[PDB]
Ligand binder design. Structure first.
Ligand SMILES: [Cl-]
Ligand SMILES: [Cl-]
Ligand SMILES: [Cl-]
Ligand SMILES: [Cl-]
Ligand code: NA
Length: 129
């Protein structure tokens, strides 16, 4: 599923991401824009042989099982395919564990390089929320 900007903002807010660990809703919408272009089916292979999955590009080295990432963990206790669903529940629940791990949203390199320190509230401007 390819979400609209305000459509995804509304879904993330319903699933409890707005101000989760102190990160306002526009931080989460900005991260999804630059990780996936709001496409739940996005996948990308990393140099280390791990793969990133879904709207927030969650990694198979730590967080999900894909059967092809040696010596990896599955700390979200989910198949990586669950992260590609039109239903964002699995991606949201796993993102809540990641952002609680100690480095906050710096876990997402695209958030640190494209969203951090910017006017992230622009990503929810105009939206009925
Ligand atoms: Cl957009
Ligand atoms: Cl915001
Ligand atoms: Cl594996
Ligand atoms: Cl933090
Ligand atoms: Na894994």
């Amino acid at each position: 599923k390819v979400f609209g900007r305000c459509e995804l903002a509304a879904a993330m807010k319903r699933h409890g991401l707005d101000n989760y660990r102190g990160y306002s809703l526009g931080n989460w919408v900005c991260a999804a824009k630059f990780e996936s272009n709001f496409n739940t089916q996005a996948t990308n292979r990393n140099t280390d042989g791990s793969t990133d999955y879904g709207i927030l590009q969650i990694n198979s080295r730590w967080w999900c099982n894909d059967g092809r990432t040696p010596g990896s963990r599955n700390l979200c206790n989910i198949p990586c395919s669950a992260l590609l669903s039109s239903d964002i529940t699995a991606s949201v629940n796993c993102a809540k564990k990641i952002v609680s791990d100690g480095n906050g949203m710096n876990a997402w390199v695209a958030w640190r390089n494209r969203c951090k320190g910017t006017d992230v509230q622009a990503w929810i401007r105009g939206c009925r929320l």
